[PDB]
Structure 1
Amino acid sequence: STGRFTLPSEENFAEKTKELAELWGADAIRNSGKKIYNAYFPTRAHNEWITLHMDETPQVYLLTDRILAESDTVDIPLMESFFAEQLKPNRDADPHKYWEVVDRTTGEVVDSANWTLDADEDTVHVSGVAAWHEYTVSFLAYIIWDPVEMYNHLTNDWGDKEHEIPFDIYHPATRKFVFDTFEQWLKDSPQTDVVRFTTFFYQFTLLFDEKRREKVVDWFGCACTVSPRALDDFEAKYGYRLRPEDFVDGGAYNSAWRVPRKAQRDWIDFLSGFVRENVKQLADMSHAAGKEAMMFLGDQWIGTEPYKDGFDELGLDAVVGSIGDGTTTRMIADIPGVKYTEGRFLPYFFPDTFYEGNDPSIEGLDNWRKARRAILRSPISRMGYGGYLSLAAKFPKFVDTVTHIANEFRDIHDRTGGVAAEGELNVAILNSWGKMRSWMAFTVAHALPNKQTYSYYGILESLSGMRVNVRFISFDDVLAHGIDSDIDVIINGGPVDTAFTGGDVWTNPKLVETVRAWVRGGGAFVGVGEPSSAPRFQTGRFFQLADVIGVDEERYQTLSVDKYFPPVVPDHFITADVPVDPAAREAWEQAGYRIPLSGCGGGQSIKPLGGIDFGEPVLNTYPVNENVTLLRADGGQVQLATNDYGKGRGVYISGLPYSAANARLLERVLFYASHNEDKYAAWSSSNPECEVAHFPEQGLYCVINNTDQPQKTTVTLADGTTEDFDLPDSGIAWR
């Protein structure tokens, strides 16, 4: 137990650095005979360069607000809705060539002969248009303040501190400056052992409004990656010209939730080739200087595509990433083609958690736990923290917390040999993106699930630390090669008309044939939210695989058809670990079920059984026939159901916020749907708040407490014997 830990550094704290490095077994130190990390920012920190070449800043297509015409002319302000300190209209590149004015009421592009850019203000004058339509402008804008340095400035209130102007290496002058500068920096940095690229060339979509608030964000977004030259080169390489609409996307800005369009994939391929070649050059230069190249998974990471084939050819030594939860841990941990991986764990060493009176040991251990369950399934090589080491030195409780965490992290390695725990089922998440977005489904802002996303993000968070093997596949994979014979369960989840359910791909009969035949043969299909949904295709069928999962969503087209709900089965394998208050169940049992009534169907429980948090409701789901097993169908609709389908099974879940109870529910769903109930017992914890990781090649299993509470649990082993555990706060026991 020595190493695998990264210490942050600071001002005149050499004494205490030596002491905390030795107590924590740190083998590396990061900058604000150890391994020395220095962050590198290829597209900023050189205002002396970019102010003399201001047409080489990165650029972005922006969509104005919708302006109502009240006659045959309308004026459209360009900048009223954007942060003028970050963004500026590009007046250099011919607006009639590079911009588009759109009648949003008809979807038609307004002829360029019908609009002008005012000479003295940032306003477009549209003429010859229709009264009472809404108009917008899609315009090129220079990004004049690095989005992340800007976010840090605002967040920390840096006041009048000079704003860092970002620059785009797509232009040869800037590219040469960047590489010459890095060449010299390498020479000037003989003490640096690891170049921590934070990050590379293109920032994820991060645009601010006129009130200095975030306006548009997408951790995967490609908005901030255009220029007149790139657009013209793209047309030459791909053989058609992109519209501004191909970037602003009606105001959606190509959110990862949108069903991906050819133009998006083409643009990703275009940037990717460019970014990767230049990242490889940086890595090679780093290597020729005797240093390792480490990439931060975030910020300017667009075009790297860590999960696409070829990432290995970059020769990056490492990826480091932000550890917020199990899902975000897996995003880092599962990346192929680097030598090692690193988590930057919480809390960051900065006053918002390190104030007098606070116990930062608690955050520190929660973060360890959320990530630990995922680390057992997919180990990360190294751990470390960032920020002010002197701030964290004040809190002796937390210093102790770290000694414990670093020791445990290292003991896992020493015991495990960096081997993943054994997975008990092979589960595949099917969506439009597949492997290229492994652990990335449902994210908008990194680590920040919200009202609209948490009912689906919980599926990944549950899976992140679960005792099963998770893979990510696309509709393209399935249509080209069928379903791999080693897969036990397919999960399709999300709202209608997204990348995550799949949109009109579900009207492709080859897809439906493939999934139906595989389930009939013994496969297992789990649909969450609006799985397999296709609007309008069939008047009487919204979820195209409703026959598989036993459930459809009423869309107000079939109200004339009475819906008959079979009685709910409250005692079932899937819900076996759900506690239900006896008085709640009694009330449910006593109130009974609706009697058939004209135009209202029948059989819906008059009171809810309850007991399970399913998150956001999917309104008016109903069972397709009375042979479907309803497990929860409260409030006149369906939350949880299972259906036999030849030799296989379908399961419907309306939504699934992460909690230990809901992860147990999903785990049971996975064993049940795959007809593997008999396989569930081996290497399981009786208590849902604990989890078991089995390591057979090492003849070993561990059990973890995912809470800060004492946990009592009984572990059932393969041979059928049981073991009682009484685990302390965040405990771990090995047998």
Structure 2
Amino acid sequence: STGRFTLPSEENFAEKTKELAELWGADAIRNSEAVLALGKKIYNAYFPTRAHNEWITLHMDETPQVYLLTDRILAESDTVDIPLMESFFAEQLKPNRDADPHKYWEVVDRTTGEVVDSANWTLDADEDTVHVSGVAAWHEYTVSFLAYIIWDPVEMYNHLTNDWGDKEHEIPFDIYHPATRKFVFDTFEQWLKDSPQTDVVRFTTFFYQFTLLFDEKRREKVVDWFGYACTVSPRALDDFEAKYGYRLRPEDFVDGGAYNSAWRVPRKAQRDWIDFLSGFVRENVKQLADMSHAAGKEAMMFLGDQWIGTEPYKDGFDELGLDAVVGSIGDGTTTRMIADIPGVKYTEGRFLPYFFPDTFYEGNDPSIEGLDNWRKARRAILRSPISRMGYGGYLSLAAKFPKFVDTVTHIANEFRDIHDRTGGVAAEGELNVAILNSWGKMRSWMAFTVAHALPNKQTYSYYGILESLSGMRVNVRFISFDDVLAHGIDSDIDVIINGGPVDTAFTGGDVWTNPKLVETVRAWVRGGGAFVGVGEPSSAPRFQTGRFFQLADVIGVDEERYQTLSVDKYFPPVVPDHFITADVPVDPAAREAWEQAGYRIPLSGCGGGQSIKPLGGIDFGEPVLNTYPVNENVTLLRADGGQVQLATNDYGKGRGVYISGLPYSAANARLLERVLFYASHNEDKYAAWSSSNPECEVAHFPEQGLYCVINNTDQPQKTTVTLADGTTEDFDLPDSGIAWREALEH
């Protein structure tokens, strides 16, 4: 067992490097001499838009820029003054005074939405303050302005996170401006000649940084891992106007203060900017990779930091001729974002923990996180294989941890053995599942994300859906409403999933008032399709007084919006024993207390049929208030506390399912998997290649005559696997184990 492993190294550490490389089977070492003689592939970081304060300080007007939105200021009379910077980090951001503020900025009456006239406001010469006159008392006002980014955001993040205190703040730069651009390509040509020992240029990353703004208290103020805020300049804006035939407003970037969060329903202006900026970016990335290839070296892209405008899931990404993409393995979902990228020769995972004093300190046990991280990646990898694993940081730190070092030895051999046994071919998927949202394929595995791998109270009930699926024995694609309006639903999809809050990219907004969309979905379901809706699926506010989820008729459930309180809701009896809930641990105490307290008897203005006490047993995450069954032919599987959390509904040949929320857990992934088989009328096809125990999952490889079963926990798991022919085999799986077995070839 050797290879597919990238080892970090450091100055004055050649013995241990040699030792570890032997131990872990490393065929590549990453940068940070007697080591260069070891024969390995050599990776070297490259930071195209920073690491040259000597230049940018002589061209400060070519730093990158961002539109920023001030706090709202209440006018208590016909004039108002607006500080521009009271709410931002001055070390990070500076108002751009060089470029005519009347041409490129916007004062706005947020109370009315109206743009204040240019003649009515002046920028103070001596203070970062705007004076407004001729305005309305008791309205709120804001300025939207261009600010130079005078400190690279991620280095800033690392500086503050590590308290580098004294150390010099690295200034970033923007190759949209041609002097700076030339600087960057000369510097890169030069560096290649000065680096013959390097084999892989590890671009970390490219030209534009994802939205990451900090406030006057040195905290994160705004972030979006997909954000295009930090991509502007007067010349880019003006070139945009000429190319697209309309002028973007600053509002098109600040977006009422939302800064175009990917959760926002996508506006045409947004996408145009992505088109514009991404073409500029893509052309220049291809240059870097051509130059790389001409120096005999490979080009590798970090999925992160300055990755904006690359758009790896959009078409043509392959025309870049990038060799590889490497990324942070945070979980299943983030593993899949990497794995699934097409148009590279190979993919690579930077696993956790980062070799750093934060997790490598005396008394802490890094191997727990090591294995847990591997376990979450491994389940995904069986569905979409990455090519290489590796670690990052100070190798000397991890060397002081014997147990960890042995843990890695284990993971490395396992990773290789999964690859050798499988041939790097993805497990067979038993069902075709499509996530449907406004973004589709360009945000594959990127839905519900805000900051990378950091779900929170607001997102985790939907993120749970992707996490569950990332490792699930199904084929997962991402499709858009434009996809559906334009081409219908491809005939191979078994299930369509639509989840999220109302008025988001992930439910779709007012596209649900488009009858053409509603027709396509209804016909497909009726004909045999399956629609799973989570949260407020198919929602459209105000369109129909008495109908919030437009496909309430398909999933059998709607959400009361305080418009329909005069209409009693009659809940049919909950069906607690069902295919879908088959694996939910039963709790005798809870079940008989729920049996004993009965259903509510009908009563005026209150409807009836609602369990007086909760059945529970399933974590559905954040509640959707007052969901109810549209009539009594819907099957209710959970309807606790006066509303619906899980329901199924027959709809001609097809079915729809409602689920209020789905945090990730071994149990909920089992629930979701069951919903998928049940809604697609594929109860029959469920048992083939499955683990009876939900803590484990099964991967079939028909062309290699194989199947494995994996333990997703750090505890022993016994499970019963069922093969296609009906036969079964028992298993006792150790802590994080795996087991292979034959099955007829094809």
Interval of TM-score (by shorter of Structure 1 and Structure 2): over 0.9
Q: Residues 514-568 of structure 1, C-alpha deviation per residue, up to 9 Å, x if partnerless? A: 0000000000000000000000000000000000000000000000000000000
User: Aligned equivalents of 1:457 and 1:414: distance in 2?
Assistant: 32
User: Aligned equivalents of 1:716 and 1:16: distance in 2?
Assistant: 46
Helix, strand or coil at the partner of 1:501: coil
Helix, strand or coil at the partner of 1:724: strand
Helix, strand or coil at the partner of 2:389: strand
Q: CA deviation at 1:359?
A: 1.5
User: Aligned equivalents of 2:568 and 2:516: distance in 1?
Assistant: 32
User: Aligned equivalents of 1:352 and 1:149: distance in 2?
Assistant: 17
Q: Residues 637-694 of structure 1, C-alpha deviation per residue, up to 9 Å, x if partnerless? A: 0000000000000000000000000000000000000000010000000000000011
User: Aligned equivalents of 2:679 and 2:168: distance in 1?
Assistant: 59
Who is 1:256 aligned against? 262
- 1:286-685 aligned at under 5 Å gives the runs 286-685=292-691
Residue pair 1:461, 1:658 contacting (<8 A) in 2 also: yes
User: Aligned equivalents of 1:144 and 1:323: distance in 2?
Assistant: 30
Q: CA deviation at 1:352?
A: 1.2
Q: Does 2:31 match 1:25?
A: no
Who is 1:144 aligned against? 150
Residue pair 1:183, 1:285 contacting (<8 A) in 2 also: yes
User: Aligned equivalents of 1:128 and 1:23: distance in 2?
Assistant: 74
Helix, strand or coil at the partner of 2:408: helix
Task: Out of 347-356 and 131-140, give the one that drifted further.
Answer: 347-356
Residue pair 1:427, 1:469 contacting (<8 A) in 2 also: yes
Q: Residues 6-27 of structure 1, C-alpha deviation per residue, up to 9 Å, x if partnerless? A: 0001120101000000111000
Count of residue pairs the alignment pairs up? 735
User: Aligned equivalents of 1:521 and 1:454: distance in 2?
Assistant: 33
Q: Residues 423-466 of structure 1, C-alpha deviation per residue, up to 9 Å, x if partnerless? A: 00000000000000000000000000000000000000000000
Residue pair 1:153, 1:159 contacting (<8 A) in 2 also: yes
User: Aligned equivalents of 1:699 and 1:607: distance in 2?
Assistant: 51
Q: CA deviation at 1:226?
A: 0.3
User: Aligned equivalents of 2:11 and 2:393: distance in 1?
Assistant: 11
User: Aligned equivalents of 1:580 and 1:536: distance in 2?
Assistant: 41
Residue pair 1:275, 1:303 contacting (<8 A) in 2 also: yes
User: Aligned equivalents of 2:354 and 2:560: distance in 1?
Assistant: 47
User: Aligned equivalents of 2:114 and 2:282: distance in 1?
Assistant: 37
Q: CA deviation at 1:356?
A: 1.3
Task: Out of 91-100 and 353-362, give the one that drifted further.
Answer: 353-362
Who is 1:4 aligned against? 4
User: Aligned equivalents of 2:327 and 2:705: distance in 1?
Assistant: 31
Q: Residues 579-620 of structure 1, C-alpha deviation per residue, up to 9 Å, x if partnerless? A: 121011000001110000000000000000000000000000
User: Aligned equivalents of 2:20 and 2:60: distance in 1?
Assistant: 45
Q: Point out where structure 1 has 5 or more consecutive residues left out of the alignment.
A: none
User: Aligned equivalents of 2:504 and 2:363: distance in 1?
Assistant: 46
- Give the structure-2-normalised TM-score: 0.98
Task: Out of 201-210 and 714-723, give the one that drifted further.
Answer: 714-723
Q: CA deviation at 1:148?
A: 0.5
User: Aligned equivalents of 1:18 and 1:719: distance in 2?
Assistant: 49
Q: Residues 306-356 of structure 1, C-alpha deviation per residue, up to 9 Å, x if partnerless? A: 000000000000000000000000000000000000000001100111111
Helix, strand or coil at the partner of 1:490: strand
Q: Does 2:75 match 1:69?
A: yes
Helix, strand or coil at the partner of 2:704: coil
Q: Residues 43-98 of structure 1, C-alpha deviation per residue, up to 9 Å, x if partnerless? A: 00000110000000000000000000000000000000000000000000000000
Residue pair 1:613, 1:657 contacting (<8 A) in 2 also: yes
Helix, strand or coil at the partner of 1:174: helix
User: Aligned equivalents of 1:396 and 1:148: distance in 2?
Assistant: 32
Helix, strand or coil at the partner of 2:540: strand
Q: Residues 700-726 of structure 1, C-alpha deviation per residue, up to 9 Å, x if partnerless? A: 000000000000100011111111111
Residue pair 1:354, 1:392 contacting (<8 A) in 2 also: yes
Residue pair 1:703, 1:732 contacting (<8 A) in 2 also: yes
Residue pair 1:370, 1:706 contacting (<8 A) in 2 also: yes
Q: Residues 158-208 of structure 1, C-alpha deviation per residue, up to 9 Å, x if partnerless? A: 001000000000000000000000000000011100000000000000000
Q: Residues 215-261 of structure 1, C-alpha deviation per residue, up to 9 Å, x if partnerless? A: 00000000000000000000000000000000000000000000000
Helix, strand or coil at the partner of 1:196: strand
User: Aligned equivalents of 1:391 and 1:436: distance in 2?
Assistant: 38
Helix, strand or coil at the partner of 1:401: helix
User: Aligned equivalents of 1:81 and 1:614: distance in 2?
Assistant: 37
User: Aligned equivalents of 1:281 and 1:445: distance in 2?
Assistant: 30
Helix, strand or coil at the partner of 1:343: strand
Q: CA deviation at 1:635?
A: 0.1
Q: CA deviation at 1:358?
A: 1.6
User: Aligned equivalents of 1:688 and 1:252: distance in 2?
Assistant: 39
User: Aligned equivalents of 1:120 and 1:399: distance in 2?
Assistant: 59
Q: CA deviation at 1:632?
A: 0.2
Q: CA deviation at 1:361?
A: 1.0
Sequence identity, in percent? Answer: 100
User: Aligned equivalents of 2:297 and 2:636: distance in 1?
Assistant: 60
Q: CA deviation at 1:360?
A: 1.1
Q: Residues 362-385 of structure 1, C-alpha deviation per residue, up to 9 Å, x if partnerless? A: 100000000100000000000000
Residue pair 1:96, 1:112 contacting (<8 A) in 2 also: yes
User: Aligned equivalents of 2:516 and 2:609: distance in 1?
Assistant: 36
Q: CA deviation at 1:107?
A: 0.2
Q: Point out where structure 2 has 5 or more consecutive residues left out of the alignment.
A: 33-38, 742-746
Q: CA deviation at 1:395?
A: 0.8
Helix, strand or coil at the partner of 2:201: strand
Residue pair 1:323, 1:371 contacting (<8 A) in 2 also: yes
CA RMSD of aligned residues (A): 0.4
Q: CA deviation at 1:357?
A: 1.5
User: Aligned equivalents of 1:430 and 1:263: distance in 2?
Assistant: 22
Residue pair 1:580, 1:610 contacting (<8 A) in 2 also: no
Q: CA deviation at 1:127?
A: 0.2
Q: CA deviation at 1:487?
A: 0.2
Q: Residues 122-180 of structure 1, C-alpha deviation per residue, up to 9 Å, x if partnerless? A: 00000000000000000000000000110010011000100000000000000000000
User: Aligned equivalents of 1:316 and 1:565: distance in 2?
Assistant: 56
Residue pair 1:293, 1:318 contacting (<8 A) in 2 also: yes
User: Aligned equivalents of 2:366 and 2:699: distance in 1?
Assistant: 28
User: Aligned equivalents of 2:477 and 2:117: distance in 1?
Assistant: 48
User: Aligned equivalents of 2:347 and 2:13: distance in 1?
Assistant: 28
User: Aligned equivalents of 1:710 and 1:11: distance in 2?
Assistant: 41
